[PDB]
Amino acid sequence: QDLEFTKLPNGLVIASLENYAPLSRIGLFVKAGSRYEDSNNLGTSHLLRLASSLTTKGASSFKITRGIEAVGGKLSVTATRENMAYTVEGIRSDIEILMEFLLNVTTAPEFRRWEVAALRSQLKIDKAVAFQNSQTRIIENLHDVAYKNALANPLYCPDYRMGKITSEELHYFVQNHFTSARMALVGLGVSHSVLKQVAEQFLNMRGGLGLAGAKAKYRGGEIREQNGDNLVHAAIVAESAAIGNAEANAFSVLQHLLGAGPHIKRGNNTTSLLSQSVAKGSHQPFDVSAFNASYSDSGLFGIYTISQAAAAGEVINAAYNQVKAVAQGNLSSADVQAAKNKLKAGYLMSVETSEGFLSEIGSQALAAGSYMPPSTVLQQIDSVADADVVKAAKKFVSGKKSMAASGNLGHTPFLDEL
Amino acid sequence: GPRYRELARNWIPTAGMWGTVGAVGLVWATDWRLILDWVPYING
Amino acid sequence: VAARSGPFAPVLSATSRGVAGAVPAAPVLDVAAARPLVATVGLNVPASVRF
Amino acid sequence: SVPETQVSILDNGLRVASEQSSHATCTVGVWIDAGSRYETEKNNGAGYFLEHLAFKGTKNRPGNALEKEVESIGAHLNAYSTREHTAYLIKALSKDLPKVVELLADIVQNSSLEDSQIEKERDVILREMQENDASMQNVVFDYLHATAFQGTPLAQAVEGPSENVRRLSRTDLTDYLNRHYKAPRMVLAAAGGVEHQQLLDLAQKHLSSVSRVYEEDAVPGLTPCRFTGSEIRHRDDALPLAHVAIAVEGPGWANPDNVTLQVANAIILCQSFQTFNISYSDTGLLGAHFVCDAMSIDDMVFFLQGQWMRLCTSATESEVTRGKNILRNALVSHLDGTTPVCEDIGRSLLTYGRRIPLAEWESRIQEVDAQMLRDICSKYFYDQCPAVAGYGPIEQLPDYNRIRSGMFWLRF
Amino acid sequence: LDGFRKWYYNAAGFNKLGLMRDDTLHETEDVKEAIRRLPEDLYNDRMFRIKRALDLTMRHQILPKDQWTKYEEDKFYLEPYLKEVIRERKEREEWAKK
Numbered sequence A: 001q002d003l004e005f006t007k008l009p010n011g012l013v014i015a016s017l018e019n020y021a022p023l024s025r026i027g028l029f030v031k032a033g034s035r036y037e038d039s040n041n042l043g044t045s046h047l048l049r050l051a052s053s054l055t056t057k058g059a060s061s062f063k064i065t066r067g068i069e070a071v072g073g074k075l076s077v078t079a080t081r082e083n084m085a086y087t088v089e090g091i092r093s094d095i096e097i098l099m100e101f102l103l104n105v106t107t108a109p110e111f112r113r114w115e116v117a118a119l120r121s122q123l124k125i126d127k128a129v130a131f132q133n134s135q136t137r138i139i140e141n142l143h144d145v146a147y148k149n150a151l152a153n154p155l156y157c158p159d160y161r162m163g164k165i166t167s168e169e170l171h172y173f174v175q176n177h178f179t180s181a182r183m184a185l186v187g188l189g190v191s192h193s194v195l196k197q198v199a200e201q202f203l204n205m206r207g208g209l210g211l212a213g214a215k216a217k218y219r220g221g222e223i224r225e226q227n228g229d230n231l232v233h234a235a236i237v238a239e240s241a242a243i244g245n246a247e248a249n250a251f252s253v254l255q256h257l258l259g260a261g262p263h264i265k266r267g268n269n270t271t272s273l274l275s276q277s278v279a280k281g282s283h284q285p286f287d288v289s290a291f292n293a294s295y296s297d298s299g300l301f302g303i304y305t306i307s308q309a310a311a312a313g314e315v316i317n318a319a320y321n322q323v324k325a326v327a328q329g330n331l332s333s334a335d336v337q338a339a340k341n342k343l344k345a346g347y348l349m350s351v352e353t354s355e356g357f358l359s360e361i362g363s364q365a366l367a368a369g370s371y372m373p374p375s376t377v378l379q380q381i382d383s384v385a386d387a388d389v390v391k392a393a394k395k396f397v398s399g400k401k402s403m404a405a406s407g408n409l410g411h412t413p414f415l416d417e418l
Numbered sequence B: 001g002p003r004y005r006e007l008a009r010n011w012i013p014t015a016g017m018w019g020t021v022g023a024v025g026l027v028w029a030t031d032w033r034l035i036l037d038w039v040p041y042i043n044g
Numbered sequence C: 001v002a003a004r005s006g007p008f009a010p011v012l013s014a015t016s017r018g019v020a021g022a023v024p025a026a027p028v029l030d031v032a033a034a035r036p037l038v039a040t041v042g043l044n045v046p047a048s049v050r051f
Numbered sequence D: 001s002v003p004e005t006q007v008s009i010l011d012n013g014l015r016v017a018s019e020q021s022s023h024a025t026c027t028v029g030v031w032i033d034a035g036s037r038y039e040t041e042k043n044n045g046a047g048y049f050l051e052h053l054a055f056k057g058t059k060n061r062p063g064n065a066l067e068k069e070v071e072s073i074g075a076h077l078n079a080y081s082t083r084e085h086t087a088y089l090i091k092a093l094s095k096d097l098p099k100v101v102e103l104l105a106d107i108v109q110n111s112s113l114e115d116s117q118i119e120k121e122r123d124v125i126l127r128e129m130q131e132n133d134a135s136m137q138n139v140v141f142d143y144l145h146a147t148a149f150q151g152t153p154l155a156q157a158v159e160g161p162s163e164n165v166r167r168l169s170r171t172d173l174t175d176y177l178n179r180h181y182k183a184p185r186m187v188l189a190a191a192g193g194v195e196h197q198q199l200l201d202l203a204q205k206h207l208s209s210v211s212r213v214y215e216e217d218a219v220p221g222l223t224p225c226r227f228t229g230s231e232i233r234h235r236d237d238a239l240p241l242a243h244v245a246i247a248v249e250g251p252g253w254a255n256p257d258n259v260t261l262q263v264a265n266a267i268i269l270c271q272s273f274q275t276f277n278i279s280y281s282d283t284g285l286l287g288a289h290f291v292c293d294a295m296s297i298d299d300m301v302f303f304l305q306g307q308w309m310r311l312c313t314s315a316t317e318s319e320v321t322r323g324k325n326i327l328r329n330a331l332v333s334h335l336d337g338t339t340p341v342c343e344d345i346g347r348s349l350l351t352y353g354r355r356i357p358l359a360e361w362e363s364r365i366q367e368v369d370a371q372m373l374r375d376i377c378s379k380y381f382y383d384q385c386p387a388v389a390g391y392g393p394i395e396q397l398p399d400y401n402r403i404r405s406g407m408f409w410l411r412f
Numbered sequence E: 001l002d003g004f005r006k007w008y009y010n011a012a013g014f015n016k017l018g019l020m021r022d023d024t025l026h027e028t029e030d031v032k033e034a035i036r037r038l039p040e041d042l043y044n045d046r047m048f049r050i051k052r053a054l055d056l057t058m059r060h061q062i063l064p065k066d067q068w069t070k071y072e073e074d075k076f077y078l079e080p081y082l083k084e085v086i087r088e089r090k091e092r093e094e095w096a097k098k
Helices: A044-050 A061-070 A095-107 A113-130 A134-146 A167-177 A192-201 A246-257 A273-279 A312-327 A333-351 A354-368 A374-383 A386-398 B002-030 C006-012 D046-054 D065-072 D097-108 D115-132 D136-148 D162-166 D170-180 D196-207 D257-267 D297-313 D317-327 D338-351 D358-366 D370-380 D400-406 E002-012 E029-036 E040-058 E078-097
Strands: A004-007 A013-017 A023-030 A074-079 A084-091 A183-188 A221-225 A233-240 A286-294 A299-307 A401-406 C039-042 D027-032 D076-081 D086-091 D186-191 D231-235 D242-250 D273-280 D283-292 D387-392
Touching: A004 A192, A013 A192, A013 A354, A023 A095, A023 A354, A044 A074, A044 A084, A044 A113, A044 A167, A044 C039, A061 A095, A061 D317, A061 E078, A074 A095, A084 A095, A084 A354, A095 A192, A113 A167, A134 A221, A134 A233, A134 A286, A134 A299, A134 A401, A183 A192, A183 A354, A233 A246, A233 A286, A233 A312, A233 A386, A246 A286, A246 A299, A246 A333, A246 A374, A246 A386, A273 A286, A273 A312, A286 A312, A299 A312, A299 A386, A299 A401, A312 A386, A333 A354, A333 A374, A333 A386, A333 D065, B002 D317, B002 E078, D027 D097, D027 D338, D046 D076, D046 D086, D046 D115, D046 D162, D046 D170, D065 D076, D065 D097, D086 D097, D086 D338, D097 D186, D097 D196, D115 D162, D115 D170, D136 D231, D136 D242, D136 D283, D136 D387, D186 D196, D186 D338, D242 D273, D242 D297, D242 D370, D257 D273, D257 D283, D257 D297, D257 D317, D257 D358, D257 D370, D283 D297, D297 D370, D297 D400, D317 D358, D317 D370, E029 E078
Parallel strands: A013 A183, A221 A401, D231 D387
Antiparallel strands: A004 A013, A023 A084, A023 A183, A074 A084, A074 C039, A233 A299, A233 A401, A286 A299, D027 D086, D027 D186, D076 D086, D242 D283, D242 D387, D273 D283
């Protein structure tokens, strides 16, 4: 059948699709990302993300682990700067107790102090594993230098805050952001009725709208961290459109025009106006792409470069110059059509998997409360037109930039030189 | 418990064997001729 | 830095004495692209970042 | 209610299989029964270097023409090579189904190996091999394959020795291409929003005339390998962590107790500790890959060994039920996504000769109980000589007598 | 029964060393898990009370009668934390049994 939606009077969104899949998935989406913290409770969302298997009021930890592993189901937590999503999946004959476990975890945690004291070492280990690659550190640095208050908060807990996050901070964060008006329960392979009926046992406790988050403010700035990696990972971004604004799409078409990354393995070359503009001048190994991250109040669009330290300068300059050409109208309609085809194929392959489909429905729910059929999107992306793309470009080419650099930065330029 | 019982089964033959080995060894070393007088060749 | 800094001097002058609270004893883990990071952690599924 | 995988066969011999689903992002993919097992130590990197070069240049699409086309519809182009199979797959939209198939046709035949391109790749491959050593678990699994299949074509690696990589001739490659790219050893697999009749038409037009006749009847043939229990201990104490893999001989693709062995893996200290059932044809390696600090490898080995014996001697129904549930969630399906379903078909037509449906997998899972699990585990784990591969600070890793002897419980 | 329990509390004699009832529990595995889950201030008071009782037993003295632990006042602090340890312990045991 099709997707089916009810908005409950306490604000909770219920979305269901019964496709008679052998494995069914059920996720719950909360507007409780890392942007809702301030300087007093930094890293609380990271410990909340890692605290999904802790003794809940309804279920002891042993059960919340042995019962999910007994049926072979999976419980995972995915977190962005805006949204958290707790997802369970398993055989249709066990999703009743899977919803019991998931809704107990979402609605009634206990946050015992010895459990979080044991979890803080896992928090440190998870942060080290996450920052084992340079991209993660350079994107966290880029957000920290790009924004002032809201979206500048890191996804991972700072080093000083380990050992300082308490049970009361987790309880305050849950009581202020895990309310029914900020939650959508989305189920693929289940009946809508049960979701409605599992939305009453729980998700009825907190009916508020939660403690809304401050508006994110852009700051600009360039940060460089000599780390030794032969490769100077450099991200240069500027402020862009919010998710909803039409301009948004234009920026997605602009990143797929300026390269969206590789499309071929071990042979991903000349796949980008950027890649072409770098490769016509530099014979060193490189990786240049376009970065776009848009959140419900603000967006970042820019370029991302990995290169040998020595060439790091002009490669960045070459990439920047290519965007300036797009800001001068130097583009062809066939290139924009190919960018639109790449963007729509990427969207369809993102929603072709079950967990990606459940995430998409989830995001749409929290964002606009409505489901937008894949088809609808296709015609809206088509709405974006050439001039629109050019426009977004000039926004980037003019707006104050924010630069995060890492590596041997002896030949990496600055923003006033860039 | 139910599970523990299953474990027992798997070890029952094993225990029997070891017990059997014990029995055999005991008789052999002890030189007990009562039981041994009941074996075809060694008897004597 | 005698007349220029004064009180701020000791901040710009290492002074290892060479010859002639104290420091309190001041990790190895198991083992590109562009897109907003999205951290993931699972009950049993190992964590991951799909940037 | 899962749609069946329909298989047809073309005169050439290539099997143009397919599958269909509401999805609209199909993954078309050519699988070839050609890997490092079919190489004869004089062309040990031919499949890898053809994989690196196949995408870069085809006769009809000169230079980087193909990679442009693939960009024009926004499709994704991937390829991989194992010791037994090679795959070239494209993720695209449904409406771009014909041209994608035509693109795949060029990639398998009419491909052009530019001697220049050959050279550029040589650099890429050599350098990576020169940096591949960085990935320890890859080093440990290559060491395990080498010491377990000593003297056979299964010891070598997909990459091959540096020498073979340096020395490669358009002609050598041409041979591997003309020898191991036969039409009866090829499957055209499609998953997602594809029609089987349209794919069968496209198959003939673009993928017909695929070679099928070998040269001077140099029809390849294969060797049943030997599992030589042995160890390899690459000691390098400067590394922070140690990677240790211990395996025994696996049954193969066609032996059904694999399913039972998978349940045993689903039943199973030192950081990462993953169990594995590498299963090549006519042999495989059941086992474990545990990383660990130098001071705990010893204990880990014991723990691992302990677990195995427990599975040979004291398996209960509850852990068997848990392992069956864990296995039944590794079922690959449309919800797993096209590429995964795509891949299965190709591997199922290459290995089993047919696509095993998920209902048959569920039947073979539910027939597994605790008694046959401990019987099959005693058949494959108990009192067997393992292959051991260690890399890192592995001095406290026990030698071969302690490992082998630990494989038998004096109490049974 | 209440008065006879007070008389037995006086006859037990750990109140004369200033100890609580939960200080006198034998540290098994469950008791050590319950002690580890205590907050820092309660743990520090428990360790000081145990050290003072050991010092008084060393000198073969007791506290003055105004400093003894009144039966009514004794607080069973470890008890709440202990029950949980036992509950969790049993749950785990049952799971294995089954």
